[PDB]
Symmetry: C3
Subunit: 314 residues, 3 copies
């Protein structure tokens, strides 16, 4: 299968500059060279150039609505184009708002896809529930078909068309949810595994259940959106919103290993890696490294070892 | 339900001064302001003033028997008074010897209560088994009805009346027990889950079993005595006796989340937080913070999120 | 049962000097004095003196073949001698190459023994698969009967005689395996539990299964070879090849506790503790300490507590 890496150096989805440096950091750490050594064909598309919208005035509380809106429409066009050529897309964030474009362009080709969202946050705040106007916490609000018409039309997002429903998305790692958000997921009935559920069942049971829930009936493509702040701050500290009590390096790799074994991975997002939020040069390498490990794991790398087929090592 | 915080700035239960600063540290971190934001009514009673007994001579090996004895009789009177007004009591330690008063005053109103003890130690050393004379490691020895008359009468504790039996107390987190103690719990048959049991069954199974064991038949009030050194030193380092291989931040929050879901929480002790034993200013904030989190969790705060009933966030 | 500690201050199995200091560090930390306080009889044999072979030229890629070969033949003679006197042997590494002699001498008395290998590596590289010539990553290649004749005869190992087969060895903790190695274990069908298997089943299930696999039919002696780098670098950092995502202090103590409960422990290796690779004096004490804890756990020490039989502590 072919792989294409698409860099999205965007940070207008939140107040913390530096996230747009994520893609460069992940390459510097050799992400693309390490993927070539797997069983997949890899091509690096490069970084999209995002045009900054002049006089992008705030729409009520939301900030940079036109800049974030345009950025995502441009990304969505690239993802669909590549998805079309029969290739698995790999999106390197900046901030989580880029999830809008990524999933949108993906669904245009595979409208029957399912989303697995690993994050410490649900990011399902609408333009009216948000205490802040940062769009990195509203990504899933622009994608749900059960939320369409539940909030005004934001300047720059007219092109967006709800592509997935509450029943097509499972959350793993939740531990810092806002009131309005916890309301939306209880109301719409979204399947989720917060940290208490992981603690209760174990990572194994969790993955065994998210699959039967999504792939139980039909076998459809999988889009994995991975917010680096889903793992515990001790593992991925260089991020804008770290929260204690997260998934461990081991649990993170287990998820991806199980997702690889399905053979259905079609889309991937490595979001929120902010190289500038490292307290020490090493806290940044730690973050960059585990993110790289999570991507290599998604494409074949196992902890038990790997060896080439038809080669007699003895 | 109403909540009342009672501060017990006492440290005579052991040689390490500084524990009496625990209550002040927990307030400074905003414990009381954060509880008001829950669904409970909160009132801060303040800190009890403990009269130091002059010429409090050692009773054989035990130290400060009259000072610790008086301190606890004074606490027991406050707890019963507040328990009486139909309020859940929240005791902020100093040292673990204050468990005596806390549980005593509690049982006077609810003689049919059960105790869940989270700690790395059993603290069931009697005045004769103790290698040290510190009374913070003898709290549960003054409360058991199966131990009454098994050790002389210590000056200052004549008012104490055994209020619970071996079958009414479950230990979770045990990993540093003395020989004499491990004997007393095997003899009296106390239900316990040491770290090996947690590792074997998982935090979920552990809680599922402590409940059926205690609440299986009758539904009685629950008294949670939480010794901060039950969590691993990496999470709660500012304590007098840290021991590697403890419960994790996640497991700690799971316990309380399950205890909240019962609706039976009637008493609470946050013991052994010693602000002065922090190697760095941050090791102390880490300890204070997780302790605060454990108390908010006990009263409704969930990791999956919380939202106010009857409010339409959409 | 009697115990005999044998020190193997050897480091020729790899490029990192300092490992030969392991045995001294573990004694300094009081390993022998703490074992005497258990229910076992302990005798300290001392450290073997290893003669350095002059002009020990490299055999193709392998380094120090004659020095490592001789060292192990000398160790195997001591282990068999002591095993013969009906005593459990305890080998204190240097490097993992000393596993050759240790297991060899052991099997000479108990040819029906089984091996439990706790390590982050399989160390089953043959003289032809190794990317490096270091023999610490080839120990298991000189012991398997299914590999005999699959690689030339290395100078210094003519005395070695394959003593165990693929079906008699279980690996726990794998997470950094070379291609050729992962090939050998898939081909020969070696039973293993890498980190993903531990994550999936839990330490309890893992131990429950390694036992039924090995002791299911016949009850045979157990040889536990423990490579300190099997535990996560946060617990045992002073080692030549640390790898993130390992077993925890708790899991490590659980394994040994279960192994003790079998009553079949006959051999023990505490390998790869390198006192000189500590970044700080404390990273070395942390390593030394957990290793000491693992050995005391192997011989009776439980986390739930221990008390002497026939003594009435009340
Ligand atoms: Mn997030
Ligand atoms: Mn997110
Ligand atoms: Mn205590
Ligand atoms: Mn304690
Ligand atoms: Mn090894
Ligand atoms: Mn190793």
């Amino acid at each position: 299968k072919p792989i294409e890496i698409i860099g999205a150096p965007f940070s207008k989805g939140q107040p913390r500059g530096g996230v747009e440096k994520g893609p460069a950091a992940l390459r510097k750490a050799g992400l693309v060279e390490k993927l070539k050594e797997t069983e997949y064909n890899v091509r690096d598309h490069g970084d999209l150039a995002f045009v900054d919208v002049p006089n992008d005035s705030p729409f009520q509380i939301v900030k940079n609505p036109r800049s974030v809106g345009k950025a995502n429409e441009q990304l969505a066009a690239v993802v669909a184009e590549t998805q079309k050529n029969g290739t698995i897309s790999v999106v390197l964030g900046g901030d989580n708002s880029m999830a809008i474009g990524s999933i949108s362009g993906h669904a245009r080709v595979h409208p029957d896809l399912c989303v697995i969202w690993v994050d410490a946050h649900t990011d399902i705040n609408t333009p009216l529930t948000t205490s802040s106007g940062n769009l990195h916490g509203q990504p899933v609000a622009f994608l749900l078909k059960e939320l369409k018409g539940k909030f005004p039309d934001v300047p720059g997002f007219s092109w967006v068309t709800p592509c997935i429903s509450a029943k097509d998305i499972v959350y793993i790692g939740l531990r810092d949810v806002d009131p309005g958000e916890h309301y939306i997921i209880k109301t719409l009935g979204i399947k989720y595994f917060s940290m208490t559920e992981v603690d209760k069942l174990g990572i194994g049971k969790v993955m065994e259940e998210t699959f039967s829930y999504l792939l139980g009936r039909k076998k459809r493509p999988i889009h994995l959106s991975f917010d680096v702040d889903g793992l515990d701050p001790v593992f991925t500290p260089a991020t804008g919103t770290p929260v204690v009590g997260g998934l461990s390096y081991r649990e993170g790799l287990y998820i991806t290993e199980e997702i690889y074994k399905t053979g259905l991975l079609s889309g991937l997002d490595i979001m929120e890696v902010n190289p500038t939020l490292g307290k020490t040069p090493e806290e940044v390498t730690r973050t960059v490294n585990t993110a790289v490990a999570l991507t290599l794991s998604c494409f074949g790398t196992k902890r038990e070892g790997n060896h080439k087929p038809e080669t007699d090592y003895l």
